[PDB]
Structure 1
Amino acid sequence: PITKEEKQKVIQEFARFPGDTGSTEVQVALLTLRINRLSEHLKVHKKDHHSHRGLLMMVGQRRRLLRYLQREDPERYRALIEKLGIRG
């Protein structure tokens, strides 16, 4: 499971300014963590249809935000994917 140790690391990695815990950048960053963590767990345990939902949900949320990005500053979005590595 994800640890505080690893999680806060991710934040510090994306936050716009020191001392910030909740911004799109961050919001998204974090999901992706869980998602990847989830995905990897779904390569095994293909019988876990339950966690498979929460997944779709997470993904639902993820894209829900990025759409919000393409709305306000595109500059920020264009740069977020490169820093995460999305699309496909």
Structure 2
Amino acid sequence: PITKEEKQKVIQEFARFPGDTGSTEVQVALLTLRINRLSEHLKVHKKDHHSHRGLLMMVGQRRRLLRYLQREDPERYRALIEKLGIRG
């Protein structure tokens, strides 16, 4: 949605391809952004109840991200963990 700042270091760092940004890994990263801008939602809005429009999958997309990636690979559970916001 932004533009030039949509690649300053979003996928280019996560997506290692012109189409590896839609992967599940690059998304888990976008799961963090939608998180920070999720609390500042009603802190500016002023006419659009029914918030949280499916804006929950983002939280569940980290509280158990290992149940998917780490599950289909124990090694993959030790790379984006330091570049997303999993444990420490």
Q: TM-score range by the shorter chain?
A: 0.5 to 0.7
TM-score by length of 2: 0.62
Give the Cα–Cα distance (whole angstroms) in 2 for the partners of residues 43 and 87 of structure 1.
28
Alpha-carbon contact 1:15-1:26 (below 8 Å) kept: yes
Point out the more displaced range, 43-52 or 3-12: 43-52
Going from structure 1 to structure 2, the CA distance change for 1:22 and 1:37 (only over 3 Å counts) comes to same
Shift of 1:71: 1.1
The count of residues paired between Structure 1 and Structure 2 equals 88
TM-score by length of 1: 0.62
Structure-2 residue corresponding to 1:28: 28
Which one has a bigger Cα radius of gyration?
2
Going from structure 1 to structure 2, the CA distance change for 1:47 and 1:65 (only over 3 Å counts) comes to farther
Alpha-carbon contact 1:66-1:77 (below 8 Å) kept: yes
Shift of 1:43: 7.5
Shift of 1:70: 1.4
Point out the more displaced range, 55-64 or 36-45: 36-45
Give the Cα–Cα distance (whole angstroms) in 2 for the partners of residues 43 and 7 of structure 1.
27
| Deviation per residue, 1:10-64 (Å, 9 max, x gap) | 1111114454232121111111111122235577889998545744332123445
- RMSD across aligned C-alpha pairs, in angstroms? 3.5
Going from structure 1 to structure 2, the CA distance change for 1:6 and 1:16 (only over 3 Å counts) comes to closer
Percent sequence identity is 100
Structure 1: stretches of 5+ with no match in the other structure: none
